[PDB]
Amino acid sequence: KQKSDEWAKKVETCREQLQEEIDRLTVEKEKKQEELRELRERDQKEQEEKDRR
Amino acid sequence: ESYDALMKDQHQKKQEIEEELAKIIEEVDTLKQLFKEIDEEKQREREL
């Protein structure tokens, strides 16, 4: 019983840690990707202008 | 098992976020650098 309760305690600790790390990961998510994609269409428009010229 | 079960799922999920948040910074930097070169040549061409 002591071993199993220690197991459960480790369960809570690991879950809280993982939740924190994943939450930070998501908070950082979808910020640089927008800039990269916008630069992508910007270069596409520049190249199309160049080719039509 | 529950712990195991939970952990597996959770761990896997985090990886995707990493995958959707990692190995993209350098691509952004490279595109920005090429844009900088293109705009600098544009400015030089326009000055000429």
Q: Which of B21, B23, B27 is nearest to A21 (CA)?
A: B21
Out of A11, A21, A32, name the one closest to residue B24 (CB). A32
Tell the burial category of B7 from Cβ atoms under 10 Å away from its Cβ (0-12, 13-18, 19+). middle
- Give the DSSP letter of residue A27: H
CA angle (A27, B11, B17) in 5-degree steps: 35
Judge: A32–B3 Cβ closer than 8 Å, yes or no: no
Question: Could you tell me how far CA B20 lies from the centroid of its own chain?
Answer: 8
3 state DSSP class of B14: helix
Residue type, B13: K
- Name every residue whose Cβ is closer than 8 Å to that of residue B34 and which is 6 or more positions away in sequence: A43
Stated in angstroms to one decimal place, the resolution of this structure is 7.4
Query: What tokens does B38 get?
Result: 């293109």
Experimental technique behind these coordinates: cryo-EM
Of A22, A29, A36, the CB nearest to B28: A36
